[PDB]
Every structure is written in C-alpha cells, then in structure tokens.
DNA sequence: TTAGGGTTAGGG
DNA sequence: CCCTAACCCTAA
C-alpha cells in the first residue's frame, strides 16, 4: 500500500466534524463525510498533525 | 473505540 | 536523502 496525502478537501472535513461533534469522536465525523480511505484511527492522526502544524 | 507513544515511507 | 506526515500498537 502506498500512502496518500491529505486533500485540502478531507482536511477541510475533518474540521468541520471537529467543529460539528467535538475533538475525539472520530468514528462519528467519519461517518458525517464521504471519506474514502480513512480510518477514525486516521483521522485522530490527521487531526494530531493538523494541530501541531497550526490548521 | 480513542489517546498517546512508537514506526516508516515518500515527498520537500 | 532523510525528516516528518502518514502510518501502527495497544492500554484502558
């Protein structure tokens, strides 16, 4: 398996489920977007990555 | 099932 | 290359 960066679009997402349900509930947010490919465990990372890069 | 530490692969 | 974002491991 090759690994693939995050679009702005899944990035914009994840946000949104943060917003929309609050930090930790991952398997809701993703459940809340079409998200192909990403795990809830996913996007815990993602959100890890986006905070420590200021998004 | 998520939190937090550890791992690795691919792009800057 | 080699650093770091995308992964993995696992307690609770």
């Given at each position: 398996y090759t690994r693939k960066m995050?679009?702005?679009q899944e990035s914009?997402?994840?946000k949104?489920?943060?917003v929309r349900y609050?930090?930790?509930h991952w398997?809701?947010?993703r459940?809340?977007?079409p998200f192909?490919?990403?795990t809830a465990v996913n996007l815990k990372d993602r959100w890890r990555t986006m905070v420590?890069?200021?998004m």
């Open positions: 995050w679009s702005v914009e997402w994840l949104q489920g943060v609050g930090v930790g398997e809701r947010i459940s809340a977007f192909a490919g990403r420590k890069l200021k």
